[PDB]
Ligand binder design. Structure first.
Ligand SMILES: O=c1cc(Br)ccn1CCO
Length: 119
């Protein structure tokens, strides 16, 4: 029932994601010189360094907010891909599966702890 435990759990999950070769295209903001039309397609860029920095700054109140930003990394990849068979999009799907597998208990434990706090 630790209401704060999600933060270190998210830090550790972000460390695992950074060790994953599949996270390479998503570790830093998409380079607009490499993809000049990116902002014509994507309204809200997101990447894992921005997620880690937001967390470290104390700018996430809950793991649900962090999860919304990580899911935005994957929806941006899906929206920008010219093909469902592209290399970067394919990496995003594996990384998303790994992220969802690991974030589930973090969310469950946090929501359970908050329900206990307000019991
Ligand atoms: O998300 C995508 C998908 C393709 Br295909 C190319 C670039 N980006 C940005 C991350 O590299």
């Amino acid at each position: 029932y630790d209401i704060q435990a999600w933060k270190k759990q998210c830090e550790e999950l972000l460390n695992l994601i950074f060790q994953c070769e599949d996270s390479e295209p998503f570790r830093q903001p998409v380079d607009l010189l490499e993809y000049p039309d990116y902002r014509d397609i994507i309204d809200t860029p997101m990447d894992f360094a921005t997620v880690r920095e937001t967390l470290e700054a104390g700018n996430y109140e809950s793991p649900m907010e962090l999860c919304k930003d990580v899911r935005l990394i994957f929806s941006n990849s899906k929206a920008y891909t010219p093909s469902k068979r592209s290399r970067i999009y394919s990496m995003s799907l594996r990384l998303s599966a790994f992220f969802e597998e690991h974030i589930s208990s973090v969310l469950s434990d946090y929501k359970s702890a908050l329900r206990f706090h307000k019991r």
